[PDB]
Design a protein around this nucleic acid. Sequence first.
RNA 1: AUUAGCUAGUUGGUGAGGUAACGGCUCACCAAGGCGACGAUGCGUAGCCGACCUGAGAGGGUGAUCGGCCACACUGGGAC
RNA 2: GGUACCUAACCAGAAAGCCACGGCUAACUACGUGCCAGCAGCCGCGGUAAUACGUAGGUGGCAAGCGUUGUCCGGAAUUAUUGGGCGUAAAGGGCUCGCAGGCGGUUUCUUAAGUCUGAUGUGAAAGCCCCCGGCUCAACCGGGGAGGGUCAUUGGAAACU
Lengths: 136, 164, 88, 84, 195, 131
Amino acid sequence: PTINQLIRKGRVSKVENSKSPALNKGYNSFKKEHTNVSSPQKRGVCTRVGTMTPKKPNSALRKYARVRLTNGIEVTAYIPGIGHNLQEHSVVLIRGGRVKDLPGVRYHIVRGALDTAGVENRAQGRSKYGTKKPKA
Amino acid sequence: RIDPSKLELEERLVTVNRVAKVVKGGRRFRFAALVVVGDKNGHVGFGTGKAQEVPEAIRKAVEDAKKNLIEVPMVGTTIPHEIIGRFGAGNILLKPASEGTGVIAGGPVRAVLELAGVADILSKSLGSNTPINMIRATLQGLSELKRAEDVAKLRGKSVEELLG
Amino acid sequence: AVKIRLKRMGAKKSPFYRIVVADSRSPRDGRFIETVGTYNPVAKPAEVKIDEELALKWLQTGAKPSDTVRNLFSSQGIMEKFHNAKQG
Amino acid sequence: SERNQRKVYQGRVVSDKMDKTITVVVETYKKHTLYGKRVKYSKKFKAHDENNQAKIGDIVKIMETRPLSATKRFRLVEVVEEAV
Amino acid sequence: GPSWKLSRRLGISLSGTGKELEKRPYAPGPHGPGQRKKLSEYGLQLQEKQKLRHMYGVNERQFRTLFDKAGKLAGKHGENFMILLDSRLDNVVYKLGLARTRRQARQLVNHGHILVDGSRVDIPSYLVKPGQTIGVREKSRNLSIIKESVEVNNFVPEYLTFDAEKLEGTFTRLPERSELAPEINEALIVEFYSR
Amino acid sequence: VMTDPIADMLTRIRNANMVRHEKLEIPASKLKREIAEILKREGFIRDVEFVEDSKQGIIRVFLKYGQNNERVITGLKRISKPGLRVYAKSNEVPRVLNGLGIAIISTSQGVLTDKEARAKQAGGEVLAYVW
RNA sequence: AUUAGCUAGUUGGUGAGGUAACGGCUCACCAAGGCGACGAUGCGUAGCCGACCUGAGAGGGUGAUCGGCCACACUGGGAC
RNA sequence: GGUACCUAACCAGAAAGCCACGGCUAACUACGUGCCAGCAGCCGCGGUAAUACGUAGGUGGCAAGCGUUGUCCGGAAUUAUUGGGCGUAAAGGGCUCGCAGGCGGUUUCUUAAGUCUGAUGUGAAAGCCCCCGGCUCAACCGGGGAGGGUCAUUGGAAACU
């Protein structure tokens, strides 16, 4: 609008969140607080691995991890591969991936982590899902 | 005036919209069309295309194209000055540039300026992304152009006095 | 302390030098006041280019260079023109 | 061989209760680096009055020097115009 | 690559022949004789860019910057970028006739050693200016690659001064785009890499 | 109230263009009288006339319609609003409609056009845009 | 501003001491001022800058390396 | 550091991959499969003919790299000064009296704070950018120049504020 209206209020600029909140904060022990690291990827510990359903028209039951990171925050992640490898108390590296279909989980588990061996018999999609080149 | 049909029209299409209508039984799918039509020597136009098929809508686009053409000034294969057209919620501005700058325009708009022959336009679709009104955003601005020798005749002034 | 001297520039293997009036307290790539022209060691021929006049104003104020810098001035006679001014 | 001239202004006086000193408001005003319109600020200092000839709302010049006390970095030049 | 399987995708004899279109104009593949469709501008301006970059095999890390190096050049930016990739030293070797393919000209720069005003140049991407001489030392003086391609006496372009046994190559003011590219449409690659 | 004198004279010229009136009235201050001679001397007005009255004065304009149906003045635009003083320098003298249009510039050495401010190389306030 | 009241060596003067140097910098005395809706005080936050990246420009983000300067040397305080 | 380098001798011999392939977006078929296994950035794909899952062939992408990931900018004119709004789409305070702040009729003299402009001083160097030269070109490096200041002093201009 008018100019003197703009000067003593300013343009109140638009603040946007991240694509995933639980990658943006790290932990340090003896400080006993909750640092702002903005690291991409973290290694986490699974606690409960049950499975459940997606929400709507797609109805085919998913894999539903629940992982606990090194920040201290327990965020349910997702297992992408064709069948899993994980059991309780494992090493789980997490990249930022949005799952529209499942309610609440916004974290893939990197199939191909330190503990996640690659999915069985996969040729296409080699870099994803952690499989080596089979034989050359 | 009205541009005559004694030209060489090139008439390549832009988009096709399938467009419905709901009767007692069910829907009725027809097709919509719009084709930018002109030469490469300063005459641009179009018409709507409505049919019950694909190719007859392409035919009937050419009719109102030959009913409605419009002419653009081609000073140095540019637009002679800067202008901003504002027809119906799609703003598309028009900026001239040097001759190496090519045709940087929107999707349907790029199939208009090459059908003028004018090859030096910077533009930016401010308004909506709808194909009829963006073409209406171009020719309405191109209608409001002016020529260098013409406005000096309008002012009763020298043409070179408009430059120096 | 005020030593007119070289200044290391250029790539890894082939160096480059700029002849620089500065304080020795600042580091090898440190700051300065005003420079004179160039030095090229990696040319097997010549091209050591000096302003040849501006440092003489600084030598009348007094700024002792190192000898590896100084003998370039002898090759262009800055010091001998300056020694004539000291004999003047 | 004249030495460099110091900072100097003129302005307008709010109060006089300070002992042999006052405040003086400078009203220079500038544009903003984003929009362009030119608004006015308030710039006030502490100025030495060796004669204590000060008034509320007095037009007067100030002249800086070495800092005479805490936040006092000016002396007067000429009492230009007085109040009513 | 195959260097001929990629030009039938473009559907043109890119070196200029009568072959690689006969018996099979459909581009590659089992979806070849299944009749093709009509593309978009993005469908065109890829192939219009790729009808020029597959002439010289330039990877697009090296194709982007030469477009930017035409940006600082004066003149029309379309025809400027025509000059730099026909002042390419790979193209200069091929336009002196001693290579049957421009891919054959790559070994004629890499290890088929060749002398540009001095020692040697192992650079297939050297930007060549007017005022340079090109020769080959006695170590690879007359091999059968050159010996057969001397005998393949092709037409010499009019921006070049070339002899067979003397083997020297110099220039004129510029290679002219009217002489250079009969097939490649310009002014589309610029509007590709402006976006 | 009236908030500025030059705004309500320029749009009054513009609001006569869509109806094609012959004559106008503008209450004619000093800088109002000098804008009108600029448009008169450079091809936008048939003739301008001064009226000496007792109230404040009136200036009147004969609009220039030289051709069939073609308004010479196709729009006006006041820039330096009271609260935004566009001071374009003499290095960056804004020419409008690049090749065609004029902008009136009030300089220290008179209220000038583009051209008379250009060669004399002195800038300042930019009071209007003229198509 | 979902921080509106904040400071008594604070703020003034005089003298004294002290500092390479001006000074509430220190102390006595005397005075009650000073800071504030142009946002004080407070709080969370963070080394700054030539520059880096991006944008067509206006701007926005970052302040790593190389170059400028300040601050710190297990944490804190003093001093030769 | 006998390192760069150059000289001669030797062999197709040492050496390519990941990603995409419904629409965005360049490129498609065959098997497997049957709301299950699985894809998914967006619209959304599979309850038996999946060009969207997985595999194979075949294309296409780019290349010693390619994808994914987290960041920041852009497209985003989607905080809009240049470069939006407010009848119903998000938005007029229920309306007033008004201090501060905001803006000013006409004519004329004057002043120069704003403004305009010169001169001088300065904003180091490296970097961006103008142009050359050097390294087998490039990248890189060098030479010269510009540019960058709501800068300060000084001298001019008087229409507008």
